[PDB]
Amino acid sequence: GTRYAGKVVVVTGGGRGIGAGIVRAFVNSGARVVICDKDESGGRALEQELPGAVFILCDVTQEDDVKTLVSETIRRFGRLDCVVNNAGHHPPPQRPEETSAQGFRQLLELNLLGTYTLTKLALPYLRKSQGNVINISSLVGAIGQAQAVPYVATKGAVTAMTKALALDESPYGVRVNCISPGNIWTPLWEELAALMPDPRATIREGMLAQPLGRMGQPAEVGAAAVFLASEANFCTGIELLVTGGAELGYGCKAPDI
Amino acid sequence: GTRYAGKVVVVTGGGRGIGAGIVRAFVNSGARVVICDKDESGGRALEQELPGAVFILCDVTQEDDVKTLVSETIRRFGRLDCVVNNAGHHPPPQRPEETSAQGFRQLLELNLLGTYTLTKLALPYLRKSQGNVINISSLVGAIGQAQAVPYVATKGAVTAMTKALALDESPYGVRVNCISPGNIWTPLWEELAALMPDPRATIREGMLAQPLGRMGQPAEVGAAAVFLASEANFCTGIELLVTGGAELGYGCKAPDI
Amino acid sequence: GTRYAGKVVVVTGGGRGIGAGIVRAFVNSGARVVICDKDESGGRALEQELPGAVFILCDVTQEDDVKTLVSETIRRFGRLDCVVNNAGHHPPPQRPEETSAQGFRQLLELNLLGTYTLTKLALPYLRKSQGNVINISSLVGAIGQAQAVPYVATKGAVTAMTKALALDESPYGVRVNCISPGNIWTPLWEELAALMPDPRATIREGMLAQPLGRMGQPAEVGAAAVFLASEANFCTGIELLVTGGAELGYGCKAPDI
Amino acid sequence: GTRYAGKVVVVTGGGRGIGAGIVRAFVNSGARVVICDKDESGGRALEQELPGAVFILCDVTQEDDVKTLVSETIRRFGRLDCVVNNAGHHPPPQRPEETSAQGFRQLLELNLLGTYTLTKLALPYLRKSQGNVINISSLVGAIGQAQAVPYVATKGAVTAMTKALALDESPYGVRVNCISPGNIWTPLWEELAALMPDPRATIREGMLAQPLGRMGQPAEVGAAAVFLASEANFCTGIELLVTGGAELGYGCKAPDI
C-alpha cells in the first residue's frame, strides 16, 4: 500500500479491461490515479468505487482533450509521475486485401499517435518528478498475428518508439518502458470472440495458445506496470512480456515440399 | 547472371543509394527491374545505363501513382515476381519535444503506408507468380536510435507488418521478408552528416559504430535482397540484419548511482 | 513486507554482490531465505544480520552439496517456493585463442550445470508449492561481449534453458524465468576492473555503456527477482532485462570499405 | 558456379542431412569442400559423387581428430576460407527429470565444444584468407522446445558464442555468423519421428508447425550458408532463420484462471 505512495499516475483507456486493472493496481500501491477514457460509463463508476482515483473524459486522438488532461492533472494534484498509455483497439480480423489505408491511418491515430501525444505533453512534468512512461504494446508487434496487418504494425511502432524515447529521455532521468501483453481476458477479447462463427471455440483456442493454458488478467498487467513505475529504476527501454509463454516453442501455425 | 532470370522486380526509391544498389543486384542476377522513384534524375540515368532496367516516375505516397506503377509493370513485362519497398526517409536529428504529430504522420505516409500500398496492389500478381515481398526496414526499429522517435517508430512498424503479412500470405505461397540495414553509406547518410557541426567526426563515429569498422554498401543490401528473392524459399517473416555487427556488444551510449 | 510472506527461497551465490541483494530483497518481502555459497565469509555474516535468512555452505558444482542444500531447506522450513540460480563467474578478459576447452568445461560446470542441478533437485518441491525458478543470466548472452567467448556461451545456454524448462513445467504450474543484468556494480566487477591497465578508466567506460550513465545495483536485480517470484503469475519463460538500456542504440564498437 | 570459386570449405557432419545439403551447395558454387564426419558411409559416397568434395573421417569431439582435419585440409588444398560447424545431435524427447548432468555434458561436447574446437584450430588460417565461420544452431535455442532442455541449452550457447566470436574476430576481418534452422526433413528428423507412438502424426504436426505448411530442405540451409560465406560481407554475428515462419504468430502450445 506504499510502494508508490505520494505519486500521481495517468492511465489512458482506464475505464475497463487492462486499463482498469492498471488503475486498480496503482491505487492499491498508494498512488493517486487519473482515469482517462473516451467513454464515461466504466471510468465514472471506477472513480466512485476507488478513493484516490478520479475520472477525466478524454479522447487521446484529440490533442486538445489530451492537453486538458495534463493541465487538469497538474491543477488538481500538483505533480505527474507516471503515464500509462493503454488506450488502443484491435479491429475485427481482416484479410490484408480487406484493409484500407484510411483504416490503417485511423488505427495509427489511436494506437500510436495518441500515445505519442500524451507522452509529449507529459514529459516536461515527468522530467521534474524523474517520472516514467509505460506504454502498453502487444506481443504480436514482436511475433506477428494473422488477419491483423494494421494492428500489428501499430504495436511494432509502439515498441520501437519506446526504445527511441528511452534513449532520448535517459539524460533527464525519465525511464520509458513498455509491456507487451499476450491474450488477456478483457471486454475487447470477449467482443471479438463474439464476432466469430464459434465464439466458444475461439476462446478455447485463445486459452490454449499459452503454455500456461489460460489467458491473462488485467490485474497481472497491472502488477507489471506498478513494478516498472515503482521498482525498476535500472530498466529503461525494455519490453516486459506478459503473455503466459505464448511466444515459446512450436505450435500449430498452418514432407519438405 | 541467371539466379533470377525471367523474373520481374519493382524497386521503390531505386534512383540512388540502397535502392540503386538493389536495382543493380537484380539486373546482375538476370531479372528485369522497374525502377520507381519520385525524382527523375538518378533513375532515368540508371535506365539508360542498365539493359533490363526501366524507370517509372512514381511517388509511393500517391495511391494513383502506385496503381499506375503496377499496371504499367504488368502491361510492359507480363508478370511481377518481387516488390522491394525501399523508398523511405530519415529526417534530420530531432529531439522528441521538437517533433510534431503532423511530421510523424507525413513520415508514416512514406516509410509505412507507401510500403503497405504498393504491397497491396502487387499481391494479386505475386500470388500468380508465387513471388515475394522484401521490405527495407532498419536496425534502429529493433534497437532504437537517439533523436529519431518518428523514424524509429515507422521502422518498428515495417518490421512488424512484414511478419503479419508473412502469416497472411503463407497459404498462398507468397513470402514476405525484410532487411534491416545499419549504417549504409548513401546520399542520405552524406546529406545528414553535412547538417552536423562536424560532418567528418559524425561520419567517423558512424563507421566506428560497427565492429567491422566501416559502413555498409548498397551492393551489400542488394546481395541480401537477391538472396531473399531467389534462394530463400523456406524464409518468410524474417528480419535479415545487414549492419556490420552494430547491434553486438557494449559501446558508448551515454558508480551505481 | 508481506508480498512473499510465508514463502521459502533459496539463493545460490547469495553471500555477496547480486546474490546478497536478492537475499535482502526477499527477506524484505517477508520470505525466509536460504543463502547458498561456496565461501563462508559473506553469507555467514548475512545470516547473522538478517532475521529470516540462514546460511548453508554449498558449492553448486558438487551434486551432493546441492542435494544436501535441498534436503536441509525442506527439513528446516518445510517447503520450497523459489530457487534463484545466481551463482556464476566471469573470467578475466580472454582472447578466443587464449581460451581452452577445459576452461570452457569448468565454466559450464558453474554457470550452466550448477543451475541445472539445483533446479532439477528442487522441482519436485516447487511442483508441490506451485513455486518458480529464477535464473540469473546476462545481457551478453543475448548481444555478445568481447574477450568472453566461454562466458557468453554459458549465458546464452542459461537463457535458452530457461525457456525450454518453462515449456516443460508449465503443465505443472511452475514458472521458470530469467533476469539478464547488464553492468551491475559488485565485487566481481570491482575485481575484474582491478586487473586492467587503467581500472578507473575501465569503470568509467562501464558506467557510460548505459544510457542511464551509471551501473546497476544488486538491490535493483533483487526487486526484479521479487517481482518475478511474487507478482508475475502470467510470466513464464521471459528474460527480464536489468541493463540500464545498454542494448539500445548505436555506440562505439570498433567510409564503406 | 563461380560465386565461391577458388575457395576451400570444411563442413562438419557433412555425410548426410543438412550437412550434405551444405556440401552440395558449396560444390555447386565452385568451392572445394572437405566433408568431415564421424561415420564413413554417407561422406565416402558423397566424395565419390561430387568432384571437388573429399571425405576426412573426423569426430569433432576428439581434439586430435580435429587437429588432423585442419592440417590435412591445408596440406591438400593450401588454404581454408570457411568452416561450417554443422555436426550435432538432438536426443529423443526427454522430460527434464529424465535428463542427467552427464548426458548434458556429452551433448555439450558435440553440439558446443566440437564447434568451439574446430573454430579455434581454423581461425589462424581464416585470418590469412579473410574467411568466415558459419555455425548451425537452431530456432529452438531462441524460442525453446518441449522435452529438450539439454539440446535447447546447447543451441542457445552456439548462437551466443557466434556473437561473442564475431566481436573478437571483427578486427581481423573474419566474419562469424549462424543459421538457425527450424524443422528440416533429414535422417535425424525421420529417426526421431520413428520413436514416437504415431510417427506419421508426429511428422504431420512437424509440417504444420510452419506457416508454409511443410518442413525445410537441406538444400535451403545450404543456400543460406553459401550466401553467408560468399555474399554477406557486411554481416557478422547474425542469426539467419531458416524456419518457414515457425516463430511467427500464435499456435497450439498447451478463461483467465
Ligand SMILES: NC(=O)c1ccc[n+]([C@@H]2O[C@H](COP(=O)([O-])OP(=O)(O)OC[C@H]3O[C@@H](n4cnc5c(N)ncnc54)[C@H](O)[C@@H]3O)[C@@H](O)[C@H]2O)c1
Ligand atoms: N486484451 C488483450 O488480449 C490485449 C493483448 C495485447 C495488447 N492489448 C492492448 O491493451 C490495451 C487495452 O486493451 P483491452 O483489451 O483492455 O481493451 P478494451 O477495449 O477492453 O479497453 C480499452 C479501453 O480504452 C478506451 N479507449 C479506446 N479508445 C480510446 C480513445 N480514443 N481515448 C481514450 N480511451 C480510449 C475504451 O473506451 C476502453 O475503456 C490496448 O492497447 C490493446 O491493444 C490487449
Ligand SMILES: NC(=O)c1ccc[n+]([C@@H]2O[C@H](COP(=O)([O-])OP(=O)(O)OC[C@H]3O[C@@H](n4cnc5c(N)ncnc54)[C@H](O)[C@@H]3O)[C@@H](O)[C@H]2O)c1
Ligand atoms: N542509409 C542508411 O544507413 C540506412 C539504414 C537503414 C535503413 N535505411 C533505409 O533504406 C532505404 C533507402 O535509404 P537510402 O539511404 O538509400 O536513402 P536515399 O535518400 O539515398 O535514397 C532514397 C531514394 O528514395 C526516393 N524516394 C524518397 N521518397 C520517395 C517517394 N515518396 N516515392 C518514391 N521514391 C521516393 C528518393 O528520391 C531516393 O532516390 C530507406 O527506407 C531508409 O530508411 C537506410
Ligand SMILES: NC(=O)c1ccc[n+]([C@@H]2O[C@H](COP(=O)([O-])OP(=O)(O)OC[C@H]3O[C@@H](n4cnc5c(N)ncnc54)[C@H](O)[C@@H]3O)[C@@H](O)[C@H]2O)c1
Ligand atoms: N556483475 C555484473 O555486472 C553481472 C552482469 C550480468 C550477469 N551477472 C551474473 O550475476 C551473478 C552474480 O554476479 P556478481 O557480480 O554478483 O558476482 P560476485 O562474484 O560478486 O558474487 C558471486 C557469488 O557467488 C558465489 N559462488 C561462486 N561460485 C560458486 C559456487 N560454485 N557455488 C556457490 N556459490 C558460488 C561467490 O562465492 C560469490 O559470493 C552471476 O551469475 C553473474 O554471471 C553479473
Ligand SMILES: NC(=O)c1ccc[n+]([C@@H]2O[C@H](COP(=O)([O-])OP(=O)(O)OC[C@H]3O[C@@H](n4cnc5c(N)ncnc54)[C@H](O)[C@@H]3O)[C@@H](O)[C@H]2O)c1
Ligand atoms: N533437422 C532439423 O530439423 C534441425 C533443426 C535445427 C537444427 N538442426 C541442426 O542441424 C545440424 C544437422 O542436423 P541433421 O538433422 O542434418 O542431422 P543428421 O543426424 O541427419 O546428420 C548429422 C550428421 O553429423 C554427423 N555427426 C554426428 N556427430 C558427429 C561427430 N561427433 N563428429 C562428426 N560428425 C558427426 C552424423 O554422422 C551425420 O552425418 C545439427 O547441428 C542439428 O542440431 C537440425
Ligand SMILES: N#Cc1ccc2ccc(C(=O)c3ccc(F)c(O)c3)nc2c1
Ligand atoms: N482471428 C482472430 C481473432 C479472434 C479473436 C481475438 C480476440 C482478441 C484478440 C486481440 O485483441 C489480441 C490478441 C492478442 C494480442 F497480443 C493482442 O494485442 C490483441 N485477437 C483476436 C483475434
Ligand SMILES: N#Cc1ccc2ccc(C(=O)c3ccc(F)c(O)c3)nc2c1
Ligand atoms: N544524430 C544523428 C545522426 C547523424 C547522422 C546520420 C546519418 C545517417 C543516419 C540514418 O539515416 C540512419 C542511420 C542508421 C540507420 F539504421 C537508419 O535506418 C538510418 N542517421 C544519422 C543520425
Ligand SMILES: N#Cc1ccc2ccc(C(=O)c3ccc(F)c(O)c3)nc2c1
Ligand atoms: N574487457 C573487459 C572487461 C573489463 C571489466 C569488466 C567488469 C565486469 C564484467 C562482467 O563480469 C560482466 C559485465 C557485463 C555483463 F553483462 C556480465 O554478465 C558480466 N566484465 C568486464 C569486462
Ligand SMILES: N#Cc1ccc2ccc(C(=O)c3ccc(F)c(O)c3)nc2c1
Ligand atoms: N517431442 C518431440 C519431437 C518429435 C520429433 C522430432 C523430430 C525432430 C526434432 C529435431 O531434431 C529438431 C526440431 C526442430 C529444431 F529446431 C531442432 O533444432 C531440432 N525434434 C523432434 C521433437
Ligand SMILES: OC[C@H]1O[C@@H](O)[C@H](O)[C@@H](O)[C@@H]1O
Ligand atoms: O469481459 C472479460 C473480463 O474483462 C475484464 O476486464 C474484467 O475484469 C472481467 O470481470 C471480465 O470477465
Ligand SMILES: OC[C@H]1O[C@@H](O)[C@H](O)[C@@H](O)[C@@H]1O
Ligand atoms: O554518397 C555516398 C555514396 O552513395 C552510394 O549510394 C553511392 O553508390 C556511392 O558512390 C557514394 O559514395
Ligand SMILES: OC[C@H]1O[C@@H](O)[C@H](O)[C@@H](O)[C@@H]1O
Ligand atoms: O564492491 C562493489 C559493490 O558491491 C556490491 O555488492 C555492494 O553492495 C557495494 O557495497 C559495493 O560497493
Ligand SMILES: OC[C@H]1O[C@@H](O)[C@H](O)[C@@H](O)[C@@H]1O
Ligand atoms: O530422410 C529424410 C530426408 O533426408 C534428407 O537429408 C535427404 O536429402 C532426403 O532424401 C530424405 O528424404
Ligand code: NA
Ligand atoms: Na475516487
Ligand code: NA
Ligand atoms: Na535500360
Ligand code: NA
Ligand atoms: Na538470520
Ligand code: NA
Ligand atoms: Na570427389
